[PDB]
Amino acid sequence: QRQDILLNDHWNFRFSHQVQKNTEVRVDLPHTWNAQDALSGKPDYKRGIGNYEKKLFIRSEWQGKRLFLRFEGVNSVADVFINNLHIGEHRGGYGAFIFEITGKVEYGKENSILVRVNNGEQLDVMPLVGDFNFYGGIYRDVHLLITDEVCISPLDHASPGVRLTQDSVSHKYARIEVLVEVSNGSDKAQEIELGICVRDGKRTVTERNEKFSLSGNSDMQRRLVCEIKDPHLWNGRQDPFLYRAEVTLTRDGHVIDQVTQPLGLRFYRIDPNLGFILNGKHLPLRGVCRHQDRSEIGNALHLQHHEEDAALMAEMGVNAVRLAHYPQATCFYDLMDRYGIIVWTEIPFVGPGGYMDKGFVNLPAFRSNGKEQLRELIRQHCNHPSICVWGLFNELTQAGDDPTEYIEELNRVAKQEDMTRPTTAASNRPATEPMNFITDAIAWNRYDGWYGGTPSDLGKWLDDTHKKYPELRIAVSEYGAGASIYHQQDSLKKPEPAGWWHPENWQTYYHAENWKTIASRPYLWGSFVWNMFDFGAAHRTEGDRPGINDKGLVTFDRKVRKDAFYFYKANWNKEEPVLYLAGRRHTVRRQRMQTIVAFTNQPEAELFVNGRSYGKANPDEYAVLKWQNVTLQEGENEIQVVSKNKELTLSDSFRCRVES
Amino acid sequence: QRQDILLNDHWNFRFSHQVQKNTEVRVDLPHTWNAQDALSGKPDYKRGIGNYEKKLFIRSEWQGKRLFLRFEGVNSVADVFINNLHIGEHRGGYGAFIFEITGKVEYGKENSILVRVNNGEQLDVMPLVGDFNFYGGIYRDVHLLITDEVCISPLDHASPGVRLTQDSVSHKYARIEVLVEVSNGSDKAQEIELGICVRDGKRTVTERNEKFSLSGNSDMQRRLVCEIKDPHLWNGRQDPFLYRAEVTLTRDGHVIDQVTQPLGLRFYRIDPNLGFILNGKHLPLRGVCRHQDRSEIGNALHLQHHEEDAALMAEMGVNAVRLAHYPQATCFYDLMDRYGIIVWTEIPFVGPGGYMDKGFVNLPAFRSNGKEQLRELIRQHCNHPSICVWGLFNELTQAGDDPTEYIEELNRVAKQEDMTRPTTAASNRPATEPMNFITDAIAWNRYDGWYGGTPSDLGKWLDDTHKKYPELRIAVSEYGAGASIYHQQDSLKKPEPAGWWHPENWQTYYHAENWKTIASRPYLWGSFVWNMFDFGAAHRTEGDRPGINDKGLVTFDRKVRKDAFYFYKANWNKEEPVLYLAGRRHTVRRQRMQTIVAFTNQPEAELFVNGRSYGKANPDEYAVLKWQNVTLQEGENEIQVVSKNKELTLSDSFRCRVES
Ligand SMILES: [Cl-]
Ligand SMILES: [Cl-]
């Protein structure tokens, strides 16, 4: 009944700095204008105003309906015009936002949609700093909504208008409360029927409907309640079961409007000594971090790109994700729902880390806008079963303008919006700083063995902190190491992090030792690898090219899994057979005697070097096969590893050459 | 006992516009400095001088041996220095070159190689213009060669020092004339023995040997003639058999130097009416072109990039390739040797096409340099069996400085170097121009149905040219149409080539019509798709991003095969099963009525639309399955095709949305 029309095709664009006429060029949404300058490594890429114009014919039959323009993302600040009259402004690059254009168009005519987008710097719109790209543009989809004059309202913070809250969840019973925004845009009072039907496919599981009166040009909220006995729980990747919940408005029979949403029922708690308990059973959060960009296109992502990023994490055995450092797309939360991957999602309250300036500036506009951004985050995505914590900052400092007061304010805003999920944060503060003690959970970013030290520093630090504050729920927000797939060398030696040489073997070593450190500590409720993918950061000058943070387990184009990916796949994915030699891309070696390493989830593998066996071996606790003192021969070599397990015979091999 | 040592590791690099004392950064060859600016679509990318400096310890134990630095490719003009003294210059960006440093180095001590590289514009070093990128730098490997003082010389145009000329080849008998460059670098005359041993695996097919004395500080060119009764012919992709031919130098019973080269025996001819005939059988040349670049790295390619490029053509059923527009890597020629893919390779005498300026400036240095580039091509790559024609130019114009005489000179030079291979060229000249009649075979670049006109124009023009000049050997050297994989619509509609809109469905239509035209004309000895892959051309402003020529059948990162790829693969690859729905990336459609099209090499296949069967169908002569008047649903559809040929059931499917 209700209509949702994609508006991405054929816009006109120009930069306000192109001040002459006839300078517009065709673009097609999604779109950023920084996919070339920023990705090329230019730190001063284009940050300012871009102008999108669309011609949209408003049909006559649409008069008497209600028309909305929903934007799923526009970085950073957007001003919307209909036939060149301002209708609204939205400040924030990552929440969806909406405007009703029912009273603003000429029915039966072409009309003009004009979106003036600014991604230039501000001190009053988070994020203010960050180790990533602030791609400017309409980089997510744009939709025309047409509904009945009486509808389930899409206007409240661009939420769906249906909000599904879970309490009393057990293996035996669950209670769901359903908050519905209903809007009467007619001049007449209406007697409507409101109904909720929760379904398993096409089988009704529960159902309640309600008749009530609503005056003209008025909206009110309705909160229905229903129950499910012996509910089918959403249980992570073991069984990511999903009800669909349909809320309908009815009038004289026949549906007049409909909204459907996912319902995944789960209970869980974060235990200071046991970690994360999902539906009564402990669950390691084997996590990675993910940014929303890609090679060549920046953050103008299409559906298939989200799907592919999800598939690669699923393949590696990921069961948790931190979506850094901002609200991300509905269809990615969808995929995490459907795969059973637990989600940490946060507002863009990002501090400087090792860089300059601040993530917090004590401006009324900044503080206020931040609260609206956190309110957008929760109201737009709270229905997703995969979301399990709400994150409030990444790497703020207490020096200069101190955000501790404001963070406490944000924490309270989160609880007003959602009591059912803990808050968390990603800190790089000494443990004594108050801001580590506000959120329900806390976590630190740690690079022991990359930005200085050795991996053993990590377990000591975490052990000490867990001892001094026994009630903290500690996790590793970030840990990782740079790696170019074209940087190879025989020996493990710690590269300079800020230089043009990130040899792949050190990333491998780093994650091996670090996962060992994490896996020995059950008090950590999760760990999150920085990062799943290389991602654009235009100011970086390191690795094999500028403009890239190269700590991904997979390359920026999603083409090449680095060695470390297969290390995590050996450990985390016990379903697909894995047998993978490390260092296949080290193809020109200077030593004759080497240490060979493979990763497997098989019980046993045997190494062969020019057909000459070097023995069977079993992986250690963390899936690592290792043969020291393997003599290669001058010139060409072939290195093959083989494993048999009943009918399952696996093989991996590569070639290489030794010079001197 | 000969030594070959890669020098790609850790060079110091700085531009000469960086004037200050410590501005050097680390690079690792292969290297270009235009990986970021040119591929970003900046038309004025850095064209000028950069400087590479390498410190090399010259072993004490190397005195008494000879030492060579061989560069496989430095774009454009190189100046090599040892210990900051000048030792030579090379003008040309695409041919190997070598410099002996035996007498320039201080033995037992650390020595410094400096390479000053210039890709700034010149009017006297082809190529002067071109629809592609002039990536500066040492973008190919650098080798230090260490040989006995008496050696098989690597000095003559950086050749291998062994030329295998096939002077008479048949199914019964083959004569091969071997020319070996020998050099006595010592100051005493020397009695050496020369050996050539032609092997099939470990088996000696023929051997030939001779003794002589050579004087000190002296070179001479030895010729040995070999026969092979009933030779095993390199027969393209049906049987790309390769003999190994190893050349040894011997002194007092011991081998002191060796160079091994590939030998594939074949005979062929180009018939004006019959096309290309390989070892007696007519072979249609199913061909594509290929530039030597790739996303993110530019032309600084590694071996795996070459290998993947070649696997992609092989998968598609390519059997011929035009390497445009310049001499390419030995590594890649070796792949075509092994795959059986016939190779057209050309010097970079490239004209302006639809752009400005000139391929040819009548300067004496331009002319002599061109002759040296053509000698480098033939002498370096002559041994590769896959190479079958030599190209002399691409889209020169007779207006202004007329190159026609100079082309006659070039043709003469080619024949001085190789009487076993015909010469060809790629013209955009009306057939009446004399420059179409110099080379033995000719070919035109035609874009009928992209740069104006319809595809059927192509056959009309071909047939007419064929009829007027019945002794010309005509091929189609380019034909193509751009496509973005992100640009989709419902109707076939000719886009504007220079505009920001290249819908994928036109390229599909274009190649299906032009293959039909080409496939019907046996007088075309070959046809070459422009292009196998999207490639860098900074000046370009079309498709979905600037700086890209998007006529590739496969995208610039080699991740996504466009629809047309599968059209060729269904026609050309008959060994792997193909069942491929066209249009899968057109996910949002505006019209419920559709024509569903699929490519297959299977006998028949059944279309299902939302489980509803639209009956079985058969491919056409060009492997196209088509179902007319297919009726889709509003909202989500699913489209699936199935083929069974027991024992083989194949399936392909995709999801789109209809939204009027
Ligand atoms: Cl801060
Ligand atoms: Cl010219």
HEC readout, B339-399: HCCEEEEECCCECCCCCCCCCCCCCHHHHHHHHHHHHHHHHHHCCCCCEEEEEEEECCCCC
Q: Indicate yes or no: CB of A6 within 8 angstroms of CB of B588.
A: yes
Q: How far is CA A528 from CA A524, A552, B30, B361, in A?
A: 11, 12, 35, 61
Domain boundary among B555, B577, B599: B577
User: What's the CA gap between A584 and B541, in Å, rounded?
Assistant: 39
CB of B495 within 8 Å of a chain A CB? The answer is no
What's B228's DSSP letter?
E
Which of B41, B295, B486 lies nearest to residue A557, judging by beta carbons? B295
- Return the structure tokens found at B310: 């070649």
Same domain, B461 and B342: yes
Q: How far is CA A510 from CA A173, A483, A492, A530, A573, in A?
A: 45, 10, 10, 12, 20
User: What's the CA gap between B320 and B285, in Å, rounded?
Assistant: 6
Cα pseudo-dihedral A27, A28, A30, A31, rounded to 10: -10
Q: Would you tell me the crossing angle of helices A330-339 and A364-381 to the nearest 10 degrees?
A: 40
Residue B203 domain boundaries: 149-267
Backbone angles phi, psi at A570, to 5 degrees: -60, -45
Q: Are B249 and B194 in contact (CB under 8 A)?
A: yes
User: What's the CA gap between A354 and A452, in Å, rounded?
Assistant: 13
- Return the structure tokens found at A40: 């090329």
β-pairing, B473-478 with A49-58?
Answer: unpaired
What would the DSSP string read from start to end of B263-294? E----EEEETTTEEEETTEE---EEEEE-S-B
Which of B41, B587, B588 lies nearest to residue A36, judging by beta carbons? B41
User: What's the CA gap between A249 and A196, in Å, rounded?
Assistant: 9
Q: Are A600 and A621 in contact (CB under 8 A)?
A: no
Q: Assign residue A622 a region: left if phi > 0, alpha if psi is -120 to 50, beta otherwise?
A: alpha
User: What's the CA gap between B200 and B244, in Å, rounded?
Assistant: 6
Which of B27, B36, B587 lies nearest to residue A40, judging by beta carbons? B36
Q: Are B137 and B50 in contact (CB under 8 A)?
A: yes
Q: Are B321 and B342 in contact (CB under 8 A)?
A: yes
Q: How far is CA B525 from CA A5, B470, B520, B545, in A?
A: 51, 14, 12, 35
User: What's the CA gap between A204 and A226, in Å, rounded?
Assistant: 12
CB of B260 within 8 Å of a chain A CB? The answer is no
Same domain, B341 and B445: yes
Q: How far is CA A399 from CA A352, A360, A431, A445, B100, in A?
A: 11, 10, 15, 18, 62
Bridge partner list, A475 = A443
User: What's the CA gap between A436 and A419, in Å, rounded?
Assistant: 20
Using alpha carbons, select from B286, B287, B321, B329 the residue that is nearest to residue B305: B329
Q: Residue A30, preceding bond cis, omega within 30 degrees? A: yes
Q: Assign residue B542 a region: left if phi > 0, alpha if psi is -120 to 50, beta otherwise?
A: beta
Same domain, B141 and B161: no
What would the DSSP string read from start to end of B561-604? B-HHHHHHHHHH--SS--EEETTTT--EES-SEEEEEEEESSS-
- Return the structure tokens found at A473: 């729920």
Q: Are B400 and B369 in contact (CB under 8 A)?
A: no
User: What's the CA gap between A532 and A291, in Å, rounded?
Assistant: 8
User: What's the CA gap between A183 and A200, in Å, rounded?
Assistant: 28
What's A561's DSSP letter?
B
User: What's the CA gap between A418 and A388, in Å, rounded?
Assistant: 11
Using alpha carbons, select from B559, B440, B436, B583 the residue that is nearest to residue B509: B583
β-pairing, A286-290 with A524-529?
Answer: parallel
Q: Is A58 helix (H, G, I), strand (E, B) or coil?
A: strand
| CA atoms in the 13 A half-sphere facing the CB of B633 | 11
Backbone angles phi, psi at B404, to 5 degrees: -65, -45
Q: Are A638 and A627 in contact (CB under 8 A)?
A: no
Close Cβ partners of A311 (under 8 Å, ≥ 6 residues apart): none
Same domain, A4 and A133: yes
> Known catalytic residue: B210?
no
How many C-beta atoms lie closer than 10 Å to residue B23's C-beta? 12
Q: Indicate yes or no: CB of A557 within 8 angstroms of CB of B559.
A: yes
Same domain, B112 and B176: no
Residues of B in contact with A297 (CB under 8 A): 486
Q: Are A112 and A209 in contact (CB under 8 A)?
A: no
Cα pseudo-dihedral B332, B334, B337, B340, rounded to 10: -50
Bridge partner list, A479 = A529
User: What's the CA gap between B601 and B580, in Å, rounded?
Assistant: 10
Bridge partner list, A642 = A606, A651
Active-site choice (A181, A346, A395, A504):
A395
Bridge partner list, A223 = A179
Same domain, B472 and B525: yes
- Return the structure tokens found at A521: 């500590």
Close Cβ partners of A86 (under 8 Å, ≥ 6 residues apart): A79, A80
H or E segment and range at residue B47: none
Same domain, B240 and B290: no
Q: Euclidean distance between the first and final Cα of chain A, in Å?
A: 74
Residues of A in contact with B39 (CB under 8 A): 40
Q: Residue A327, preceding bond cis, omega within 30 degrees? A: no
User: What's the CA gap between A152 and B151, in Å, rounded?
Assistant: 87
Close Cβ partners of A583 (under 8 Å, ≥ 6 residues apart): A488, A504, A505, A508, A563, A596, A597
User: Is B253 buried (19+), middle (13-18) or exposed (0-12) by CB count in 10 A?
Assistant: exposed
User: What's the CA gap between B147 and B134, in Å, rounded?
Assistant: 34
Domain boundary among B249, B267, B285: B267
User: What's the CA gap between B155 and B89, in Å, rounded?
Assistant: 14
Q: Would you tell me the crossing angle of helices B504-519 and B563-572 to the nearest 10 degrees?
A: 30
3-state DSSP of A149-210: CEEECCCCCCCCCEEEEEECCCCCEEEEEEEEEEEECCCCCEEEEEEEEEEECCEEEEEEEE
Asked how this structure was determined, the answer is: X-ray
- Return the structure tokens found at B275: 């096309």
Residues of A in contact with B659 (CB under 8 A): 4-6
Bridge partner list, A511 = none
Q: Is B446 helix (H, G, I), strand (E, B) or coil?
A: coil
User: What's the CA gap between B213 and B14, in Å, rounded?
Assistant: 48
Q: Indicate yes or no: CB of B36 within 8 angstroms of CB of A6.
A: no
Q: Are A617 and A627 in contact (CB under 8 A)?
A: yes
The angle subtended at Cα A452 by Cα A449 and Cα A456, nearest 5°, is: 40
Name the closest ligand to CA A362. 1
CB of A660 within 8 Å of a chain B CB? The answer is yes
User: What's the CA gap between B373 and B351, in Å, rounded?
Assistant: 16
Please report where in the chains the tokens 């083929």 appear, as a residue. B643
Close Cβ partners of A453 (under 8 Å, ≥ 6 residues apart): none
Bridge partner list, A389 = A344
User: What's the CA gap between A492 and A507, in Å, rounded?
Assistant: 10
User: What's the CA gap between A319 and A268, in Å, rounded?
Assistant: 15
Please report where in the chains the tokens 């097919």 appear, as a residue. B205
User: Is A204 buried (19+), middle (13-18) or exposed (0-12) by CB count in 10 A?
Assistant: exposed
Q: Would you tell me the crossing angle of helices B364-381 and B404-417 to the nearest 10 degrees?
A: 30
Same domain, A373 and A230: no
Please report where in the chains the tokens 């249980």 appear, as a residue. A235
User: What's the CA gap between A608 and A653, in Å, rounded?
Assistant: 9
Cα Rg of chain A (Å, integer)? 27
3-state DSSP of A424-486: EEEECCCCCCHHHHCCCCEEEECCCCECECCCHHHHHHHHHHHHHCCCCCEEEEEECCCCECC
Q: Are A637 and A609 in contact (CB under 8 A)?
A: yes
Which of B6, B35, B39 lies nearest to residue A659, judging by beta carbons? B6
When scoring B13, B24, B28 by the number of chain A Cβ atoms within 10 A, the one with the most, hence best to mutate, is B28
CB of B498 within 8 Å of a chain A CB? The answer is no
Q: Would you tell me the crossing angle of helices B303-316 and B563-572 to the nearest 10 degrees?
A: 60
Same domain, B654 and B591: yes
User: What's the CA gap between B660 and B657, in Å, rounded?
Assistant: 10
Interface of A with B in 612-651 (CB under 8 A): none
H or E segment and range at residue B245: strand B243-251
Residue of B nearest to A487 (CA): B28
Active-site choice (B395, B478, B513, B542):
B395
- Return the structure tokens found at B291: 């530039």
Name the closest ligand to CA B357. 2
Same domain, B347 and B456: yes
Same domain, A326 and A249: no
Same domain, B3 and B114: yes
Using alpha carbons, select from A479, A444, A439, A434 the residue that is nearest to residue A465: A444
Name the closest ligand to CA B401. 2
Please report where in the chains the tokens 């096309």 appear, as a residue. B275
User: What's the CA gap between A526 and A321, in Å, rounded?
Assistant: 10
Residue of B nearest to A557 (CA): B557
Q: Indicate yes or no: CB of A26 within 8 angstroms of CB of B486.
A: no
Domain boundary among B245, B267, B289: B267
User: What's the CA gap between A445 and A395, in Å, rounded?
Assistant: 8
Å from A37 to nearest chain B CA? Answer: 7
Residues of B in contact with A660 (CB under 8 A): 5
Sign (positive/negative) of CA torsion A547, B53, B160, B270?
Answer: positive
H or E segment and range at residue B313: helix B303-316
Q: Are A179 and A221 in contact (CB under 8 A)?
A: yes
Q: Indicate yes or no: CB of A5 within 8 angstroms of CB of B302.
A: no
Q: Are B123 and B37 in contact (CB under 8 A)?
A: no
User: What's the CA gap between A219 and A222, in Å, rounded?
Assistant: 10
How many C-beta atoms lie closer than 10 Å to residue B641's C-beta? 26
User: What's the CA gap between A511 and A599, in Å, rounded?
Assistant: 13
Q: Are B184 and B216 in contact (CB under 8 A)?
A: yes
Q: Assign residue B413 a region: left if phi > 0, alpha if psi is -120 to 50, beta otherwise?
A: alpha
Using alpha carbons, select from A457, A450, A570 the residue that is nearest to residue A510: A450
Q: Is A15 helix (H, G, I), strand (E, B) or coil?
A: strand
- Return the structure tokens found at A633: 């021969």
Q: Which residues in A272-339 belong to E strands, given as ranges? A: 275-278, 281-282, 286-290, 320-323
H or E segment and range at residue B110: strand B109-118
Using alpha carbons, select from B554, B8, B291, B155 the residue that is nearest to residue A487: B8
CB of B5 within 8 Å of a chain A CB? The answer is yes
Q: How far is CA B646 from CA B111, B602, B649, B652, in A?
A: 68, 11, 7, 17
Counting one residue from chain A and one from chain B, the pairs whose CB atoms sit within 8 A come to 69
β-pairing, B49-58 with B11-15?
Answer: antiparallel
The resolution in angstroms reads: 2.2
How far does the centroid of ligand 1 lie from the alpha carbon of residue B3, in Å?
A: 58
Q: Are B377 and B419 in contact (CB under 8 A)?
A: no
Report the number of distinct structural domains present in chain B: 4
Q: Is A365 helix (H, G, I), strand (E, B) or coil?
A: helix
Q: Is A225 helix (H, G, I), strand (E, B) or coil?
A: strand
Kindly report the length of chain A.
Answer: 660
